[PDB]
Structure 1
Amino acid sequence: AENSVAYSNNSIAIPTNFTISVTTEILPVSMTKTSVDCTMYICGDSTECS
């Protein structure tokens, strides 16, 4: 939305009331831990491929 602050060199704007806002912030920390095997993934139950 277009706004225009009414600026002049003798006028100020002071709040007379307030509000208390509780906002939410979501942050990732860790991810899934995985582990791999060579022979079970690549060949798998194969002696000559191992």
Structure 2
Amino acid sequence: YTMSLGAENSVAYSNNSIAIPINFTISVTTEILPVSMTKTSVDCTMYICG
């Protein structure tokens, strides 16, 4: 299918209306970041020639 970016949300804009929150959600989200890799050392002489 042709993908859909998101659901349409026509914001009810007017020159004299505001939307004020009456409540809140404490949301905890995960962010995973790689820091290091496996430290590898190669004996060049042994690898090429044994």
TM-score range (shorter-chain normalised) is 0.7 to 0.9
Is 1:29–2:35 an aligned residue pair?
Answer: yes
1:37 deviation in Å?
1.0
1:28 deviation in Å?
0.3
Cα deviation, 1:1-50, whole Å, max 9, x if unaligned, reads: 01100000011000001110011010000001000112211111xxxxxx
Instruction: Kindly tell me the number of residue pairs found equivalent between the two proteins.
Output: 44
CA distance in 2: counterparts of 1:8 and 1:19, whole angstroms: 27
Amino-acid identity (%): 98
The runs of at least 4 consecutive aligned structure 1 residues that moved more than 6 Å come to none
Mark the runs of 5 or more structure 1 residues left unpaired by the alignment.
45-50
- Computed over aligned residues only, the root mean square deviation of the Cα atoms, in angstroms, reads 0.7
Mark the runs of 5 or more structure 2 residues left unpaired by the alignment.
1-6
